[PDB]
Point group: D3
Chain length 182, copies 6
């Protein structure tokens, strides 16, 4: 993934746990060489999976829980580190934002040539609920999606209950979530 | 037009008149189905013309006057809902901004693939006046242009006197305006 | 419009009437300064209108009649002068091509930054007809659209009868054409 | 997927089995409403899957076997229907072409705003082999990738033996193919 | 260069020296005709070199020193006149920002079609130093680069010692700088 | 530079001198590691310079003389290897083509994200001459520009005499060529 993703992980870990901790995860993940992540450069995805794996081992939390915290954090990180207006433009409520998410990432991708964005399709089941289809070239990120959705609930002051009902990891076509909001 | 246009109309009407009023216009325009406008999605232009037509009937104001208020509002709405830096970059005075307006919309259009922007050509007649040519794929929006120009005068603390001297609605090639400023 | 349009007019007139006629037309249009048109450079629309009025004068043909000739010509010109794959990609039947026309001009628009390309909306009224809405920032080019549709007919080996039912020139919102096709 | 993919299936099936068979397949897929596919318009992925399942049913062939046929076909189709220079530009040998494949789809992606194109990573294990990582937002298209590689073999006049070693469908992170080539 | 560059020069001179002074430089540079620079329009580069030359003569400072002040100012000007989020996104420290600078300008260039950005390559010689290669289509701007680097040191609260060790002006391939930081 | 440039050199040398000579050159350049060039991948400029110095050594020809040969070759190569329509689109005469050259590279630059393409400015000094300003982030490629102009002469069936009057290498701001053409 692009370096910004790995910077955001470093940032969350640094700020929640301090540098020493960050350095220990970084060392563990096999990454002590790298002096700093370059935000607009492409990195092999293993970099990210190794960080989360190392953070899990070093912090004594499951991987899923780090990916959940990271997803939530990302909503704050993008808004504060150069993408605040882009976020704002993608809408004003949870239901709208999720409909715009493919278009948001298409705009990201204008600037990040090599982006491999997720794809999100909403089927609204009521004015307060939907079924969300999450399609990705990557494996293993559903818990980051749950995190992101809660981050978005906070951003819109909207309570969000989310349950995953299909699992790309067991060989289903893709992840699917039922969501109720406000 | 893109959904953001219709959100901005909903916003202006909601904030100036309350929700109930907004809902009544929305119902009248034939649009009660739509739970929310999706900002980065393309809508049929009739959506917008129907809203203005319904707002006219429900508020008891002429259509032109709504389109005038809307034009002015739009200068505030874009600056506050995700396009504040883009607006800033298009310049620092009325004369400059209008020269940049085609380039501004070309930048908008990078992100809105399907954009059909207006085209604006300035002929400066003095360092305090110009003749503005407004060319559009759409009919009926000259009063939104007058609105926008006054919104831009406010933004630059510049007094703006604008008169329309050619009328695309009577079959002239396009709308033209004489403008004096400061 | 971009210089490719002006080159096409020069080429058409030259081919059909010889160079002496072309030079006369160019001179009458007030354009003898211009040594050659630069294909990817933007020109004032006025350049094209002057060429067409001057050609009308010099040839004894109405301008509208020349614009029909020019519209058919453009389909061949574009296919032979650098856009043949782009054209092929837009479809292999009349109705399909007309549906892809905005997307064709969007692809043109990636290469011509300053493009102001017409917008075309199809309402298919059966498998052998459609209503075509032509929306344009410019005036006076509906007869070219008639010639283009005929060029496309020949391209597909499809007979097509085009009849205009609404006229921008007279103050209607946009040109609308009723199209029967085999 | 974009309509060009669906056109290609229709063309392949038509060419190989005639129109009556094609119309039967299209009808069985629940698509008799659709008068023709619009090449540059986005369709629900479901349209393509339904066509392939309906073709499998109507022809007595497994869907996977049709997707291989379709993958080989696409290499010829794209080269003949508007993408021949683009294809040529991506290389003049199998390994080179496979290395340029993301960059080829990035160029496709400039023209198809909403493209969701596969990601392909090569690990060259010698001058006569590589391991190919196929990563996709979509399920079920690994057999098409097998057919495409064979089409590319013919394009280069290179024999190629493709054997899949990892399977998304069964829950593995992504499809991985082992490729020997002359 | 694009008009924004010349606006930024006018701004720095105006704010540091007042308008009268600005007007005198502007007059001297042969530019009194131009009522205002259009930020997103392309200008001949001589415009910029003439301004700096005139400012040098009128202010009684060497050209290099103006270009140094301008470079530093530019880091503030972009951050405040519409590019603050873009700047933020290009990173969080001197070493990272300089690695992202080509990507930053590639993003600028999406919006400025005709941009001729510099190219910057970093060779890191320690976690506190590098060798920076500055490649440009233009001559004469090395002192603006030194200015920019100090502006970036301020932005990141990082002390920066920079020495130029190759000179494109004497016919070396390009400018090179040794840099130590913090 | 992007791998297409290196492929072109390999192709030229191979075609003209056979493979054994090519392999010798590649080995002498220190590049025997590289199994093949990837057309759409960016390479360090050094790769190209090393190939040219190594070819000069192995063939007994000055590097400048090879770069002329390479410049003529590129006009044919690009027209035959995927860019023939793009080339055709840039004009049908020498002067027109030279005026469109920046716009041609802008279109190339949409496909090659990281392109650093030369800038070319024409001052037409009559209908049979121009002064050509070649501005480049890179050193040493003026003799290639001489070969390209000759390739373009042949393309148009236009004799052309190119004589360089200003030299970057010696410290002048940029290369300037005086061009007479039939
Ligand atoms: C303006 C804010 C955002 C920016 C700048 C941004 C940008 C990015 C970037 C650069 C990547 C890495 C993909 C790659 O390197 O190829 C990414 C991945 C991802 N994004 Fe966003 N994005 C933003 C908002 C969000 C939000 C709010 C969501 C929540 C729904 C989201 C969902 C995801 C997911 C789930 C991934 C993981 C990659 C995958 O699934 O394949 N994005 N995005
Ligand atoms: C950064 C601020 C702006 C943004 C994001 C923006 C974006 C838009 C969008 C999305 C549309 C709808 C067109 C379509 O959907 O195809 C539009 C239309 C329009 N814009 Fe802007 N624009 C902005 C600034 C302005 C300003 C300040 C003016 C005032 C001169 C202006 C003049 C217009 C007009 C008159 C239309 C009506 C459509 C037509 O004439 O065909 N724009 N713009
Ligand atoms: C690959 C083929 C084509 C290319 C490269 C091309 C490119 C262009 C260009 C450069 C313009 C000038 C617009 C401007 O300068 O702002 C133009 C205008 C135009 N195009 Fe196309 N185009 C193509 C095919 C067609 C076809 C087949 C049609 C038929 C419907 C068409 C309809 C028009 C019309 C009516 C205009 C006039 C401008 C206007 O109405 O405002 N185009 N196109
Ligand atoms: C110039 C040639 C090509 C063009 C114009 C083309 C264009 C496209 C398009 C439009 C899609 C549909 C994606 C979407 O709608 O979101 C697609 C998908 C696909 N392409 Fe290509 N492509 C080309 C060559 C190839 C080749 C040679 C391969 C062989 C490796 C390939 C691999 C695939 C695969 C496997 C997909 C399936 C979608 C997926 O896996 O998610 N493409 N491409
Ligand atoms: C978001 C902030 C920035 C923006 C909007 C911006 C944009 C620009 C623009 C429009 C030009 C004129 C080039 C042309 O007109 O063709 C330029 C030139 C230049 N930029 Fe930036 N840039 C920014 C940041 C910087 C920074 C921080 C540096 C410092 C390393 C930098 C280094 C340069 C240099 C040295 C030039 C001179 C032109 C040349 O060398 O050929 N840029 N940039
Ligand atoms: C369709 C035809 C062409 C294509 C696809 C093409 C593409 C390219 C590419 C990829 C580069 C490498 C730049 C980089 O990697 O950053 C390049 C450089 C170059 N191009 Fe072109 N180009 C074409 C035609 C021409 C022509 C006819 C000329 C003749 C004036 C020309 C002048 C040059 C020069 C002098 C460079 C050397 C790089 C430099 O000077 O910095 N190009 N072009």
């Amino acid at each position: 993934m692009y370096g910004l993703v790995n910077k955001a992980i470093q940032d969350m870990i640094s700020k929640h746990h301090g540098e020493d901790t960050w350095e220990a995860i970084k060392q563990k993940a096999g990454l002590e060489d790298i002096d700093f992540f370059v935000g607009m450069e492409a990195y092999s995805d293993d970099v990210t999976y190794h960080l989360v794996g190392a953070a899990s081992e070093v912090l004594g939390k499951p991987a899923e829980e780090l990916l959940i915290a990271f997803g939530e954090y990302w909503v704050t990180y993008t808004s504060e580190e150069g993408y605040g207006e882009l976020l704002a433009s993608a809408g004003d409520s949870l239901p709208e934002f999720m409909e715009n998410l493919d278009n948001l990432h298409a705009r990201v991708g204008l600037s990040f040539p090599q982006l491999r964005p997720p794809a999100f399709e909403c089927q609204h089941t009521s004015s307060k609920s939907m079924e969300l289809h999450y399609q990705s070239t990557r494996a293993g990120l559903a818990p980051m999606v749950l995190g992101l959705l809660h981050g978005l609930g906070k951003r819109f002051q909207t309570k969000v209950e989310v349950t995953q009902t299909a699992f790309r990891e067991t060989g289903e076509d893709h992840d699917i979530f039922s969501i109720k909001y406000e």
